[PDB]
Design a protein around this ligand. Structure first.
Ligand SMILES: O=P(O)(O)OC[C@H]1O[C@](O)(CO)[C@@H](O)[C@@H]1O
Ligand SMILES: O=P(O)(O)OC[C@H]1O[C@](O)(CO)[C@@H](O)[C@@H]1O
Ligand SMILES: O=P(O)(O)OC[C@H]1O[C@](O)(CO)[C@@H](O)[C@@H]1O
Ligand SMILES: O=P(O)(O)OC[C@H]1O[C@](O)(CO)[C@@H](O)[C@@H]1O
Lengths: 319, 319, 319, 319
């Protein structure tokens, strides 16, 4: 290919920029031009495409968000829509396209491909739940943002011997919850992937109470409910003072950590490769510490599961 | 003196441990024994006191919160209950008490003195609302956890061209906001110290939209309502995709920044200084960049304010 | 005043931006086109002056360094160059100027006022060695970067019961060293503004090591010597395991801390007000929590000096 | 088994405590009571033991260093010492043992075993230079600590157009330097695992300084020489002012990132499981995101290497 493109759709996440720079340079290294697609798919259809000069991506490897922006486009859900984009692409000479974002980005990746247009997806989401990859760009950066709050909230959670409930993110996934909570010495972690009996969860609270430790920290994935509620439920069931904190989009910003800047660069570059190599309709990820690339279709077919043994661990490591 | 105790009442802030250490150290440097009145005034009644050794308050200078704990206590706001207070101090041979906390702690220091117990107060609250001190221990730290969150949020707020409403603490004061907002370059800071107007805001909030900047950050001093409400408000009035984030208690925990460590050590050291110099019914606080002494009563009679000129600058600079 | 300029000369410092931002924004608020001279006075000669828009300075309030770039240039010390300087100044129609940077620039700020051209200076530097202000842009940020490192070191030093000697910057000034350790928890702070007897330093580390603390953090202001040397002299006299760590320009960068961003804003805005209020040859700064402004003359006549009362403190809380 | 011991030998790293934590909790949860051996093998020999109460490992899962302490100890390399230890252990009813640390401690791990003693390894070191694992407790934290420093240096390096050299640790391994550079975006990384023509290097820099790449950052693993040398050496041949910073031991301290807490917890209790699951003379680790365990012997017999692909990747993403 002579020139390819890059766009980021879905919720932004820390590291996408790394991935952007990776893609841009790695491409520029093989003497390929990279055009930037602004405002995710929406801009694709709108025809928002500016040539990305090597100058543009240097100096942002350490930045949160996406210099390319990312919107939500409904039009890009219909033939007539995808087509109007597949043309705007050709309009500028573009021959392939790199997509960085959530699983919704893949839907387009696939369709766009089913129309005879080379598209690879790079997993970029703090939720850590795109299939075909153990981690996603932004996960370590969110997990670290969270455990960092769990640490600050633990200082004061101890000071007033209060019981705490942090509300994380990762929608229908318990990853930012599990990994995080474990990482924080969370007395209990509530995630989708596994069942929890709110009664027992309140029994141990009373138990671990007698044991001397009056401050407890409950980590709840927003996927299984709402901290706010769980808060009141615990305060009334027990009697222990209680506060509730919903971190928020803070789990979406900030400069990315080591692991995410690397992963972003390795995957981002591993995408430019699959295109120039002819392959299309592929998604790049990392499994068992190894760069893998799958079929967006057979890839989405799978489910997102967590390591139950970890949820288990976190249970035995807090009594 | 011979023996002097220390306690932390009210909401814990970053820098108390620092101030504690500075007391436990400054006093020992004068052969004065100290004591920990644990769990705020709750212990001063319960008799939860202990001896503090220089090896105890050492290595805790960087820790958020208070080792001595804190908790509310109504029995003390009375008299019949505060009588067991002076006694739990007598029986132990304590002569002077160093109080660290909010405007509410000062009370248990204004009454104890008017009872024959030298008491000194040390501003330890993130709100920055204590009278008789430009800055209270914890402020700069909290004030920093806030801007460190504004920075992650502007990330995801810039990538999605969204409008934001940040809910910052500080109860009835607008310091944690006016400052952070200004620091984090917000487009609008709403504090109880100044009359705003959603009509004037939504007017400027829009001009900036069409002008060029499609994302805005709105810091709201939790003392003017809720963010959620302004969120849903900004939303309905503009159609603008909006989100709200309530940082919350994270602003209370964390490792104190440099400025609180230095202040918590200077104030806990100027406080102990008085419990020796004799006068024991005062409270310390850095005023005009100088350590000053104040009559717990002649100071608490004052009202905390903000630098209008500073708020007026947030107006000019942000537009 | 209808079109002022803004350049930065000297070592960059986390904050210079919050200020450039503040300068421009403020200026525009008053209808005064703002141009930026790149690479300090050096560029002023070259005529490296470009117009600045409110957009240019949008989203840099939280970045370190100076987007305006900085650089040395002896030229501007010889009036032959100063002559070439006023040239580029009126060549582009620049009436007034705002110098951000170390004191090495102040000199050039005064001179320009003599050639009949406005010139206000903004104290920007991590050393905190500019007369006329208690704090300079970059101090608190740098002052922080350090303590973050002492916290880190303290861990590795503790587990290995080792004696350490960190080396902070600040030229001939001791500020960075002083506030660092004090908040850092150092046992010794060697600064230029105070005398020390290495014999005493050993006498302490050798007495403390005999007691409970089997590790210490010796902060050494780069201005008095080199940590690599005291680290040698110390591991010789005491025979204690020792390591020396020299914090580099990691102190020169980072993202301005709360206190810093604000100060920069305040000092930068007030910088524009002066130029317009017809003043000149002055220089803003903060003294006694008040926004002051002196003449670049009567100021430099004064001399920067740490607060001994704090050093003696740094010594007392140690023992 | 009813009683086991845990010890930290070798250079401390962030996460060791978190790892201690699980080895203590996982034990308690299984009835086994765990005795903590302070000061590594040196402490074993001296008989420094103490029962680890469940409340001891409480609130340390976010701390650096090792609550246990570490030291180097030749006496254990001799036959006289290994016998002194087998004796001290069997004196306090110790049946198995937990050893966390570098490849050094692994030795004694394998020793104690031959002398009939169940010991399990746990990769603890920021070097990531230990065999039988893709990662070691500390790598990640040191990895960010490095990239955070590179982000600051990039600021001043940029403001002044300075070519920079950063000397990172890792003894003989190039892991820290590889990932750091790759993730900090170093224009050139130098390591022990791959040759480098210090000529080509210069050549590239000489080409960038012309292509607006007026500033670069070189990462030198310490096991490839001193950055101070390469520093002056680059300045000499090119002429661009250069600066060198040796992060020193700030790479060893500070609180551990999310990952390291997850890995340590996972590994610790995984070691504990082996002591009970009747194993021994083995070492746990994480290869290909799988908690596998190996024999301390055949494992140490193996060698450590880096991923050439990354280095190559690091050379393309930089020009
Ligand atoms: O406000 P938004 O943009 O819809 O994002 C909320 C959701 O998106 C994410 O931020 C990313 O998927 C999730 O963590 C969360 O459930
Ligand atoms: O949950 P609590 O105990 O009311 O504490 C939160 C409140 O207290 C403070 O932390 C201190 O006054 C405020 O900032 C805040 O409004
Ligand atoms: O980065 P340079 O140009 O070598 O200068 C180092 C000196 O400049 C400063 O960064 C600022 O004065 C000092 O801290 C230090 O002594
Ligand atoms: O001065 P020390 O404590 O021996 O440490 C230097 C070596 O130890 C480590 O800190 C840990 O192995 C390495 O980074 C380095 O090679």
């Amino acid at each position: 290919m002579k020139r390819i493109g890059v766009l980021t759709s879905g919720g932004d996440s820390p590291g996408m920029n790394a991935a952007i720079r990776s893609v841009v340079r790695k491409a520029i290294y093989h003497g390929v031009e990279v055009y930037g697609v602004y405002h995710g798919y929406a801009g694709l259809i709108a025809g928002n495409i500016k040539k990305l000069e090597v100058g543009d991506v240097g100096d942002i490897i350490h930045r949160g968000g996406t210099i390319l922006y990312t919107a939500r486009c409904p039009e890009f859900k219909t033939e007539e829509g995808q087509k109007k984009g597949i043309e705007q692409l050709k309009k500028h000479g573009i021959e392939g396209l790199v997509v960085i974002g959530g699983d919704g980005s893949y839907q387009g990746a696939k369709k766009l491909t089913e129309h005879g247009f080379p598209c690879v997806g790079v997993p970029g989401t703090i939720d850590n739940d795109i299939p075909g990859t153990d981690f996603t760009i932004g996960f370590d950066t969110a997990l670290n943002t969270v455990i960092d709050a769990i640490d600050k909230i633990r200082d004061t959670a101890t000071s007033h011997e209060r019981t705490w409930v942090i509300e994380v993110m990762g929608r229908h996934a318990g990853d930012i919850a599990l990994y995080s909570g474990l990482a924080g010495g969370a007395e209990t972690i509530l995630i989708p992937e596994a069942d929890y009996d709110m009664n027992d969860v309140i029994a141990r609270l009373k138990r671990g109470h007698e044991r001397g430790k009056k401050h407890s920290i409950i980590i709840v994935a927003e996927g299984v409910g709402s901290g706010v509620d769980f808060g009141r439920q615990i305060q009334e069931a027990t009697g222990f003072e209680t506060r509730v904190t919903v971190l928020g989009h803070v789990q979406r910003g900030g400069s990315p950590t080591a692991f995410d800047r690397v992963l972003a660069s390795r995957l981002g570059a591993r995408a430019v490769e699959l295109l120039l190599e002819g392959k299309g309709g592929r998604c790049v990820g990392i499994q068992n510490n190894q760069l893998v690339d799958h079929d967006i279709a057979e890839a989405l077919a799978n489910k997102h599961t967590i390591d139950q043994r970890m949820y288990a661990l976190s249970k035995e490591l807090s009594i």
